[PDB]
Structures are given as C-alpha cells and as structure tokens.
C-alpha cells in the first residue's frame, strides 16, 4: 500500500503512519520530491519502495 504523512523541511524526512505506528524515512534529494515546504503531505509507497515529499495536491 501507500502510507501518508507529513514531511520535515529541516530534516528532509517523511513521517508516515503504518499499522498504528509512525515511521520516519528520508525524502529523496531530488528537486521535485524533497521536502520543500515544512509539513507538506508525503507518502511512502510500499509497492514501489519509494518516497515522495511533494505528493500531488
């Protein structure tokens, strides 16, 4: 599945909720996937094993 959360601009991480716990994973350093805006929605995609801290709004 895909798991949603919020990104930290300070740390360039995504904190996502999965099975009742929070998990923190680095965002990519790629320009249009990194955490550009603090607390932007982010997702960990467990099908692709990928993270995006600029999920489509």
Residues that bind Cl ion (CB under 5 A): 9, 21-22, 37-38
For residue 56, the minimal CB distance to Cl ion (Å) is 18
Residue 36 in tokens: 């550009």
In the complex, the smallest distance separating the C-beta of residue 17 from Cl ion, rounded to whole angstroms, is 9
Query: Are residues 35 and 9 in contact, defined by beta-carbon separation less than 8 angstroms?
Result: yes
Identity of the residue, 9 or 41, whose beta carbon is nearer to Cl ion in the bound complex: 9
23 versus 26: smaller Cβ distance to Cl ion: 23
Contact criterion met (CB below 8 Å) for 23 and 6 = no
């Amino acid at each position: 599945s895909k798991y949603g959360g919020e990104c930290s601009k300070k740390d360039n991480t995504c904190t996502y909720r999965k099975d009742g716990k929070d998990h923190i994973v680095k965002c990519p350093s790629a320009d249009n996937k990194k955490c550009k805006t603090d607390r932007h929605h982010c997702e960990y995609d467990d099908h692709h094993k990928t993270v995006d801290c600029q999920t489509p709004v």
